[PDB]
């Protein structure tokens, strides 16, 4: 009797809401389905106070909090974005991963979603900032905790049998140069407060 | 013309620019930046530093392998000390020894290291040193790639640098008539007893905490090596096993 | 040479406050820790595997339960050995790799 | 040599922390690496390390020293001279020096790693903008007091992208423990003895 | 990398040299063109006198 | 895009999704917003394969599965709704609350008077059916952990000053009551047997 | 811009001449020779093998 949204559209929208993002490289069918009715998906998100960005160059479709009247204080207050706010150690690791991601992008162009890094390369980097407790196992545990928390936000695949991970393309949009300037201005503010 | 010439060698900077008047600005901007970097001036310094650092790495690694070989050679003396205690035949005790493997890969490494050491003195801004270092690192990388081949193990695996030999010694004198090396002899019973005996001695030495000649964990497990052995040689096996302080199953 | 004299007390003030060895010699519990650590590293030169090190340490500390004049673990010596290894890593006495 | 090992750790760490400096041209980083390695070499512990390295080129002397050590500790007087631990250490001192110097070489190769990382920066335009931004941010990061706990877990204003909604709490998704798993297994501790006669002839 | 930087600088320097030479020529020719515009007024003054 | 959905409506929908329920007793405004906008609410839920079940007498609103039966399999695996299976203690408490709330609804009528119970009444029953964890303090800690978790699932409130909770009307719509009561019967059977 | 590009892609058939208009005869001779002889001949050799 009443209208039913295309069952495939329902599948795609619910799946994208579940995982928060959707990549052609591993889920092409739903990715294309959304790309076939982007108006429909956007309308579906409007009640949720959500929105859908696009990046066809790397093959990502990611959710983002709507901004029609959203408080500019922080979109994180939205009741349905369940994962918690990012923090500045996670932000330092995010910056390192973003630098590696852009380096890989230059190397292979947009290439494939496989922008990989060996975990052993991260340890020298964070060592400089978070310190050096002198116990390789302790620093590795700290690094893996940070990486797991980042995967909670969906920016890196968990460690695998080769101790390698793939920086998810979503990283490019979280460390968008505009967001980078915002965070950088706030970080300069805090450095001034350090006085 | 020269704008196009510059593009022929560019990598990652002039890509965004054409080859005409409007592009001259960015060309000269990057020329200014490149000259500011002053990188081309470092050439000889960095070449010599690379030579030094990679030489240090390569020589240290090779000497480390040689010292591993010496450690193994001393382990042989330790086990020989253990084996002198017990008899293999009534008037004889077993002893070990090692020869130095002669192989193509190790010989090539020797030649390349000779050239490398000869290449330090050549007053050539370190070019010949770099050539020798490149060929030696080529050998190392080749070996590390095809590790299962005999040459790769002969180079990077310490123990394969040596050939193991076993002999039977006169209790009262240095007299020796026996050798299991090069040509094994293929004896269908003697090889088995020899292997079991040497293995028991080594296993006892490993099992015995330092200083003590008696194993702390006396138990050992064995199998149809006896079936391959005759009655007399099997009895020799049991006698040797008991004499080394081993209780067995 | 007197300039070195004036500057030197800065060096010794810093070391007494900062350098690991001097701080260790200063602490009330110095002799027990030093004896145990010497015992551990003495009998091997390759660097102890952490599990072996902590087991040997929990064995050593048990010998010193007779030394009631300093801390005795009442219930779980292994936990005590693990805690002491953590602590001595924290003081940069032992770095593990 | 243990002290040399720390000196090289700190030289390498300084090289890294300076490599973060955005204003450092590529030539500046190359110059810093070269000059820092030279200075570390020239310092006294650097001279000790350099002379030991030169001994490696002249290996026959180190080999002769190890051989003589071997002949020494075997002589009966050696038994009285030292406990077995010291004899063990001294003979393999020649190898032990080789091992320890390896640790410094690891730091040098590690530093060359970051040098190589900074060499390749002929970025595209957008890549170049984000690279400027990231280097600025990382330089700003060094000055924070990382060791403190509260600094690390402070929130940042980074926007939420990739947001995922999850865990919709529908009561109808509830399921409950079911106790059909209680199938018990007997503890058959009885002695399953043997029967000698059954054995074959 | 150092080798390629050397080659790039070597090849780029001639471009800058030619550019500056051409710029010199271009200012010279621009001024010379400006001269051609004043010619009618000079000879007009002479003709009137 | 087109004009927006009412901000009040979207707020109420997001609240109902966060909590899985809405109440006239505590949130009569969003509750009446959802009620006065049922077609819009269900349309918003339609792409999600979601819907809202209602009970006006109990002052209860709650989310429920809109899924077609056996599109993939006879048992529903809604991507945005994970079907957690509780542990034994939580199941026992759920059965206790279900039966006690039913009895209170017999006594006062359906949803006429809020159902209530005291912590001190509960603890001895948990000790009876489960066993003493080692002290009264551990019993109280375990009971409060169970209550906090269930309140997370919207089933119970927090203890008041007198330490009495009110049973949420959501209990009336649990999925498998047969499993609950069979488990309760088996639990009484086993406490009888194991002695 | 065209002929300079040809010399870069060149494989020993145009290095003998420069990048000015006086070299056009060699450019054209090589162009026609390669277009008529080289392409069909190489394609047929490739197909046969």
mmCIF file of C-alpha atoms in Angstrom, chain B residues 2-3 5-6 9-11 21 24 27-28 30-31 34-35 39-40 42-43 46, chain E residues 1-16 18-20 22:
data_model
loop_
_atom_site.group_PDB
_atom_site.id
_atom_site.type_symbol
_atom_site.label_atom_id
_atom_site.label_comp_id
_atom_site.label_asym_id
_atom_site.label_seq_id
_atom_site.Cartn_x
_atom_site.Cartn_y
_atom_site.Cartn_z
ATOM 1 C CA UNK B 2 65.685 25.450 -22.867
ATOM 2 C CA UNK B 3 62.344 25.439 -21.027
ATOM 3 C CA UNK B 5 65.021 20.928 -21.921
ATOM 4 C CA UNK B 6 64.408 21.635 -18.227
ATOM 5 C CA UNK B 9 64.834 16.397 -16.405
ATOM 6 C CA UNK B 10 62.222 17.821 -14.011
ATOM 7 C CA UNK B 11 60.652 15.561 -11.396
ATOM 8 C CA UNK B 21 56.671 32.881 -21.136
ATOM 9 C CA UNK B 24 59.274 31.248 -16.811
ATOM 10 C CA UNK B 27 60.892 28.016 -13.497
ATOM 11 C CA UNK B 28 63.037 30.767 -11.992
ATOM 12 C CA UNK B 30 62.173 26.918 -8.340
ATOM 13 C CA UNK B 31 65.673 27.709 -9.599
ATOM 14 C CA UNK B 34 66.989 24.934 -5.569
ATOM 15 C CA UNK B 35 70.033 27.197 -5.308
ATOM 16 C CA UNK B 39 72.281 20.539 -2.323
ATOM 17 C CA UNK B 40 74.553 20.019 -5.383
ATOM 18 C CA UNK B 42 77.398 18.499 -0.863
ATOM 19 C CA UNK B 43 78.151 15.826 -3.474
ATOM 20 C CA UNK B 46 77.907 12.898 1.169
ATOM 21 C CA UNK E 1 68.690 12.765 -5.287
ATOM 22 C CA UNK E 2 71.790 14.954 -5.064
ATOM 23 C CA UNK E 3 72.767 13.941 -8.608
ATOM 24 C CA UNK E 4 69.347 14.905 -9.969
ATOM 25 C CA UNK E 5 69.431 18.210 -8.082
ATOM 26 C CA UNK E 6 72.805 18.972 -9.666
ATOM 27 C CA UNK E 7 71.473 18.174 -13.135
ATOM 28 C CA UNK E 8 68.318 20.235 -12.600
ATOM 29 C CA UNK E 9 70.228 23.303 -11.411
ATOM 30 C CA UNK E 10 72.742 22.961 -14.251
ATOM 31 C CA UNK E 11 69.981 22.825 -16.851
ATOM 32 C CA UNK E 12 67.907 25.580 -15.232
ATOM 33 C CA UNK E 13 70.675 28.189 -14.992
ATOM 34 C CA UNK E 14 70.876 28.698 -18.797
ATOM 35 C CA UNK E 15 67.114 29.265 -18.809
ATOM 36 C CA UNK E 16 67.512 32.135 -16.344
ATOM 37 C CA UNK E 18 68.453 33.590 -21.528
ATOM 38 C CA UNK E 19 65.427 35.002 -19.701
ATOM 39 C CA UNK E 20 67.409 37.964 -18.384
ATOM 40 C CA UNK E 22 65.520 38.526 -23.391
#
